[PDB]
Amino acid sequence: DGTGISAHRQLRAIQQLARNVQAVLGAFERGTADQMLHVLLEKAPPLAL
Amino acid sequence: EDTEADVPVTYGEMVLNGANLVTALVMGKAVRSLDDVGRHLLEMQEEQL
Amino acid sequence: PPGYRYAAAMVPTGSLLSTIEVASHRRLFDFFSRVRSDANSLYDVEFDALLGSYCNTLSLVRFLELGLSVACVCTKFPELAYMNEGRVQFEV
């Protein structure tokens, strides 16, 4: 609308994206350190052997 | 290790006076920081955050 | 849930021009009260409150902020979906 609610309700939806995109972009550097351990564990044998 | 500790002196604070007092008498709902919560929503209504 | 708010009536919207017996028609109103000279519940004040806006902060952690990036050799392709079988030769 032209009302003040319409200017306010965008911010509820726009800042909803900004909190949501940081989760997905923040997920990927986790997934680097996640998938590096699963390969290094399959590379690494235990000590006593 | 140390025998002295710097501790704050002013003990409060909450002030019901101002535009917060109007919401108490009239509406019966009052936010503690509404003196400046209604401020920041107007600049958040403008440019990127 | 109180009736008509007394602080609102302390500063009137606009003055009335006619004084009539009020109790004749009740049902043209919504909430009504009869106050003998000064009633007992006229001095009631009640309110509620919301105290504080507390959020989490997502810890934006780059992989180079970590130091497990020692054990990695990270180079990025602009295109890896077009590669089929890559390999590196080793000679000792």
Automatic annotation (TrEMBL), chain A:
Record's superkingdom?
A: Viruses
Indicate the span of the full protein covered: 149 to 197 of 1374
The name this protein goes by in its record: Major capsid protein
From TrEMBL, chain C:
* Designated name of the protein: Major capsid protein
Taxonomic lineage is: Viruses, Duplodnaviria, Heunggongvirae, Peploviricota, Herviviricetes
